[model samples]
Target: DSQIQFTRHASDVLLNLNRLRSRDILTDVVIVVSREQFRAHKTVLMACSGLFYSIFTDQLKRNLSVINLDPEINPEGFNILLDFMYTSRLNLREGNIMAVMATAMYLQMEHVVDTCRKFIKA
Candidate 1:
C-alpha cells in the first residue's frame, strides 16, 4: 500500500541520521557534564532539545566549543537521552527511569516526559 511505502521512506531517513551519528560526521561541539564530555552534532541536538537549542545558539553565542553542564545531571541519563534523540529509540528500565525522567524534564522535552510518565505508570 502507499502508506507502507511512505513509512519505508521515513524510516530510511531516520536510519541514515543514526548512521551519521555513529560515524560522527560533521559533529562540531562537545557538551561537558560532570567531567564527561559528550560529542554531538549541533543540528541534531538543536532539533531534539530546546535547552540545547538555546544553549548552543544564544547563551554560548555559538562560539564555545565546550559546554559545562550542571553536576547534578546524571551523565548516564543524559547519554540515554542523547541516544534517544539520535536513534528515535528509548530504552528505559525501572532502575534508570527516574533519573532519565528528571533530566528530560529539566531539558524541557515534553514528549519524553509524557512517554516516561506513561511507562512509569504502566
Candidate 2:
C-alpha cells in the first residue's frame, strides 16, 4: 500500500462548488435570460462554457458582471444547464431534451450536447 490516491476528490470539489452556488455564495456574475436572473460564479461558467469563456475573456467586457442572454434562449433550459455545470450531472427527458440541446449548442458546451444526443438515440 505504498501508493495511495483519492479518486473522489474531483467530484467532491465540484460538489462543494455546487453547494456554494446553491447558497448564492461568492457568486460574481449574473446571467439574465428573458428578464430572469441567475446568480453564478464567473470561473465556473468560463470553465464549462466556451461562449462564456469568450465573453468573460473579452477585453471590452472584462469588468462586466452581468450578462444578458438572448430572449430566444429558453430560461428553463438554461437553468438546467447551470445545474449540470455545477453538479456534473444532467437530468434529461424527452420534453426538455430539445430545449437543453439547443441551449447547450448556443453555449458551445460540446459535452452536454453530446450527452443530449446520446439520450435521444438511447
Candidate 3:
C-alpha cells in the first residue's frame, strides 16, 4: 500500500482557486447585487451554496453568464459571503452579523447561517 496525502492540500487548493478568481482567470459567471458585479466560477458557487447549485442545475440549459440578485439582498453582505465561499473564512461583527445571516439564508448556505447564529449566541 502506497498512499500519501498533504496535510495542507485542501488549503492550497482553496488558496489557488482564490488566486485564480482574483486574477479573473477562467471565471464563468457574473453575479450582480444591486448594480455591483462580482465575477466567479459557477463550480465554486455551486459547491458552496445550495441556491447556486439549484440555479445552475435547474435553470440554465444554455450558458448563462449574468445573474442579477434580488435588490433586497445587501451587497455588502453578499460580498462577505462570496469571500467566505472562496476562502472558507468568515469575519463576523456586531454590526454586520444580521445582514450577513440574511444574505446567507437567501443563498441557502446553511453553514454560514449556522456560523452567524453561533456568533450571535456567543
Candidate 4:
C-alpha cells in the first residue's frame, strides 16, 4: 500500500489560525475619530489590518491608552471595519459603499479598498 504525506502548507494554515479564533482577546485601546469611538482589539488592529497599523504607528504617539483620530472617517463606516476585523465579514452595498471606500482608502487598507471598488463597479 502507498502512503499519503502531510505537507508544510498544513502547518501554515493551522498555525496562523490560532490568532483567528472566534474569541477576541481585546485590548485597552479606544479609537475615537469623527462622531464615534471604537473599542479596538490591538492584536487585529495592529497585526492584521494595515490601515490601523499606520494610524497607530505614524499618527498617534505610541504607548497611549486611547487613539483619537480625525481622518475624516465617519464613525459608521468604521463600525463596519471593526466588525469585519472581529467577524471576518462585512455588508457592502450602495448606501455605505462610498463612505466605506473612502474610509478604507484613507486607512491604507488596500485589500478592502479593492474589494469595495470591485463591488461598486459590478
**lDDT against the true structure, each candidate:** 0.84, 0.93, 0.93, 0.70
Give one digit per residue, the lDDT tens place, for model 2 in 1-122. 59878999989999999999889899999999998899999889999999999998998986788999987899999999999999888889999999999999999999999999999999
| Candidate 2 ranges with C-alpha deviation above 4 Å | 1-4
Cα lDDT tens digits, model 3, 1-122, are 99998999989999999999999999999999989999999999999998888889975422789989888998999999999999988978998999999999999999899999999999
Q: Find the candidate with the highest TM-score and give its number.
A: 3
How many backbone clashes can be found in candidate 2? 0
Location of the lowest summed lDDT over 10 successive residues in candidate 2 = 62-71
RMSD to the native, candidate 4?
5.4
| Candidate 4, run of 10 with poorest lDDT | 17-26
TM-score of each prediction = 0.85, 0.92, 0.94, 0.71
Compute the lDDT of residue 121 as modeled in candidate 2. 96
Candidate 4, residues 1-122, lDDT tens digits: the string is 99887787655653454344334343557789774767655656776577567656774555676777666778888877766665567778899999888877776778899999899889
Residue pairs that clash (backbone atoms under 3 angstroms), model 4: none
lDDT of 1 by residue, 1-122 (tens): 45434658766876787787788777788888788888888777788898888877795457777777777898888999999987789889998899899889878798999999999999
Better by TM-score, candidate 4 or 3: 3
Supply the global lDDT for candidate 3. 0.93
